[PDB]
Write an enzyme that holds these catalytic residues in place. Sequence first.
Site: not given
Ligand SMILES: CC(C)n1nc(-c2ccc(NC(=O)Nc3cccc(C(F)(F)F)c3)cc2)c2c(N)ncnc21
Length: 249
Positions: A18, A24, A120
């Site tokens: 959350q 997510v 961050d």
């Molecule tokens: C801990 C939990 C909340 N969680 N969160 C995620 C997750 C889902 C989407 C995102 N979104 C994200 O990484 N956006 C983002 C935005 C800008 C740049 C980047 C980067 F390229 F740096 F990775 C990433 C992050 C974590 C996620 C996942 N993929 N698989 C298993 N568990 C997950």
Amino acid sequence: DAWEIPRESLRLEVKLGQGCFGEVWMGTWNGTTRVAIKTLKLQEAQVMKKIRHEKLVQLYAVVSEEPIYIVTEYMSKGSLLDFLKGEMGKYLRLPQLVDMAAQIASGMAYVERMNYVHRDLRAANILVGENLVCKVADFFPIKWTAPEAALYGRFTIKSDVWSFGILLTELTTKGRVPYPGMVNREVLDQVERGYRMPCPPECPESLHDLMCQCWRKDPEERPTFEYLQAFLEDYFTSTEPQYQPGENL
Ligand SMILES: CC(C)n1nc(-c2ccc(NC(=O)Nc3cccc(C(F)(F)F)c3)cc2)c2c(N)ncnc21
């Protein structure tokens, strides 16, 4: 845009986290593909689509029209932070921890080559998968922020390096909050006055040196991630070849 899929191709099964802006969810894409899905209540893509590296969480698809959804690969172990203070913590040792560090440095090195900034970076924003795979993800966290960025909003890959240094303290303490017994304010005062965290218990001084290099007052004095990656990848051969397992590290 070719990242655009229809909502209908998404099954939001389990819930996972959350946040201030949305959740997510564990999910299924096209019936056969396990995915993570971030929700809201589309600028978080301008750059997320251009990104592609084995140590950065991979975007899979979007659904722009509100509610904006987002599909990325699934990391079966959640955040590095929860992983560190979870039951796996007690079993992790320096070698495992230096390897995760290296991986992260690798990803940040790619970001470095692309002339991007993260802003961050910290354990909470690192995701873990099977076989200790770590991936940079999702880009006030004053304790993690370089001074120049905190005070004058001077955010650069160099301030990212600073955060990496702070992240190294998280790995070596199994997830403790940095600057124990200090509030955000006195952190600023102390750090600006040259204070830095001391070598964590059982942590090799060579590794604390690396941290201190990352925390140099002058952003330009700080190493590149390309250096950091190479340093950690080689750590147990060229730096600490006499390493002997301890009680925790
Ligand atoms: C801990 C939990 C909340 N969680 N969160 C995620 C997750 C889902 C989407 C995102 N979104 C994200 O990484 N956006 C983002 C935005 C800008 C740049 C980047 C980067 F390229 F740096 F990775 C990433 C992050 C974590 C996620 C996942 N993929 N698989 C298993 N568990 C997950």
